[PDB]
């Protein structure tokens, strides 16, 4: 019952034999010898000049003992002060191109310095207030930004970091959540969250353990300090092959809670980020006196950002809510909605009421699909947007964190030192989901499902361990030629730059040529999946006649059987049509015959065809002027459960009235350039540029409160606002892009996983 020869034990013991780990704390189970053996505090964390030459004393925090080597509790600054040495610091840049590691060492140990509230922009400040990170970043591989998770706070990103899933596969959707099967609710303060199931996944150190890698504790208690943190580590590299982890990791609460209260641009701001700078100094200064500072590959990583927000500016639901003491909301920078009724009426009392309003109200089905915040018993259907420093209250510090991921003041820090990573190199900004198969790789481990595309950050490092490969083709097409119904009408390698793209599942789809389109149409759902079409520079506008206003004409490769009608949408009293490819595109009055084909006819509602319209007719047009010629992918998307993976047959729960013909949930589209501009799209020599949109099938225009305004006012903004990825449009249509390139499969996985920001 004594912690002698147990301090900080990787093995837990009991119950109910006290424990001597480093988790004891929270869990209330610690000897009572625990204090005095495993934390010290006297003569402090430094070694002074007139310390120098002592004996051995066991009641001493570090020793400065000349037999202090040979254990491995040296004070930081021992060879420095002592032995007469160098700061690692001071010593020049120099590169590590093989491990340097000791005789029994089987992989290169890896450490994640993770810090609370780091914004990107505070690496902008001089090299003498951080001199220690600013070699870091300088010397290895760094990024200018890292985008985190929605919500922006700390518990649903750490976890993110840890797992490589979005939260509502991981299960924590917020530091504050309820759940209706449990019946009970997990908080920031209280015993509830030390169940283990609210914690979905498999997390980086029990895929480790699992495959006979060691892993350290990743959870520190509060109570123990900045300096023991650094001390245990240390301490655990010292000990045999046997017995010695291969993954660690330390965690600070600063710069975040001077952050809070001084907000972004205070002065009082210089000394806290003084300190973190302090103790990066004491691990590389440590890594040096062990000499396995060229050995170990070191992270340094954060989780959100900080944004100015104040007392003054909150909106208050009192003034918008019918009742207001009858529900229970989660405040703050973000909203979640639900009873102790009807939500219909209260999404309806919240739409556009006051001119300047700073939140907007949403059903978690209606979120930006970028987002990825909807599958999940925990997530409340009534949601809250709210806008850059303000807040947001039921009834009646200089900054917080929490809103939208793609906001500029949100946006995080990373930085990657060793000898696996890139000598003196600077990589573009990636996403935090991408983390753990990067982590992975490092460790020699192979990863658990996750959310991240493997391959995609393989530029990173300059030895890697994992080639990716391109999915097999499931469904091959077929090429007809040829062989009422209410409808009246009075190179092809040109059109497909990047190769045809791939379909990944079981179903009966056919080829289609036009000389201005090609097209993938599916028999099954009577529309196409996808259509291929290019834009020059050089090419104009033209105005759709009179004659050809309702002009719907019969394809004559496609069976009757199989094929859309005009009756469907004459007896649909809500629902219209529209077309994949703009008629105001043509290159000769004949070609726009091709444009009025029924093959080439979608289900729209009259509402959406005001936003559909102008970018087709004005934007299109705007995009290849600038860009210098466009290639352009768009066709449907079906997704009702909201689960962000492709609907089948059976999950289908709309159709037009009378009719077997099926309605969209949304509308994607990928525009494609040179990266080069001064070259055409269709004369390109090495990378491209990308920007696409998923934008949903509403039919009402209440998201956008100045849709009473002409369409140049508010149809751009809506568009920006739903921005989304390559491979997010690839799991909601079981679709694979960019088949047949000049460029390397690695370049092709970076531009899939790109988000055009604005
Ligand atoms: C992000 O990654 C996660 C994990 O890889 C994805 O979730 C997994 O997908 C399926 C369907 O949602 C889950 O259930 C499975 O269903 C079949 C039905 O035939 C059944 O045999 C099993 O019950 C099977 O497990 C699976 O449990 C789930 N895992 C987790 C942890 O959620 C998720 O879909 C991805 N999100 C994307 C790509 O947007
Ligand atoms: B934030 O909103 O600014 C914020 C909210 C609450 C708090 C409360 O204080 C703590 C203190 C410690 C921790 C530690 C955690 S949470 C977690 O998942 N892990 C495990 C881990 C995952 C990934 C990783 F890289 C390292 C560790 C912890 O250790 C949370 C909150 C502070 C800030
Ligand atoms: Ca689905
Ligand atoms: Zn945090
Ligand atoms: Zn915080």
Known sequence: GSCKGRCFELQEVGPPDCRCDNLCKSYSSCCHDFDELCLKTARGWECTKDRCGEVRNEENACHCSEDCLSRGDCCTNYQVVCKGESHWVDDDCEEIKVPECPAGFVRPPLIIFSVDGFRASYMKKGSKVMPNIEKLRSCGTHAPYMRPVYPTKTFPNLYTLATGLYPESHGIVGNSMYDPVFDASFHLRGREKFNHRWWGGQPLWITATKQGVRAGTFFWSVSIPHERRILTILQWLSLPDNERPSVYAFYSEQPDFSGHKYGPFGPEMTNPLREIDKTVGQLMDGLKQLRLHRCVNVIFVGDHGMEDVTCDRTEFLSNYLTNVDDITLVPGTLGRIRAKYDPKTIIAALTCKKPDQHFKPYMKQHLPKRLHYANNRRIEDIHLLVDRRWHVARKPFQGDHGFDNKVNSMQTVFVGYGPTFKYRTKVPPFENIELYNVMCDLLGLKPAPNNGTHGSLNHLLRTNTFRPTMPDEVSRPNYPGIMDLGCTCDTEERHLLYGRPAVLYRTSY???????????????????????????????????????????????????????????????????????????????????????????????????????????????????????????????????????????????????????????????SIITSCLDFTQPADKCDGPLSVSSFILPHRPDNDESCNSSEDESKWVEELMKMHTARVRDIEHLTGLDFYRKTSRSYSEILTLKTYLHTY
């Open 510 to 668: 056919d080829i289609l040529y036009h000389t201005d389109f090609e097209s993938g149409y599916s028999e099954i759902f009577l529309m196409p999946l996808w259509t291929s079409y290019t834009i020059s520079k050089q090419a104009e506008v033209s105005s759709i006649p009179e004659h050809l206003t309702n002009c719907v004409r019969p394809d004559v490769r496609v069976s009757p059987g199989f094929s859309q009608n005009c009756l469907a949408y004459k007896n649909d009293k809500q629902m219209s049509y529209g077309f994949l490819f703009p008629p105001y595109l043509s290159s000769s009055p004949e070609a726009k015959y091709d444009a009025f084909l029924v093959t080439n006819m979608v289900p729209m509602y009259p509402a959406f065809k005001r936003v559909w319209a102008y970018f087709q007719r004005v934007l299109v047009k705007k995009y290849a002027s600038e860009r210098n010629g466009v290639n352009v992918i768009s066709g449907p998307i079906f997704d009702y459960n909201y689960d962000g993976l492709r609907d089948t047959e059976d999950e289908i729960k709309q159709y037009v009235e009378g009719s077997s013909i099926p309605v969209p949930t949304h509308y994607y």
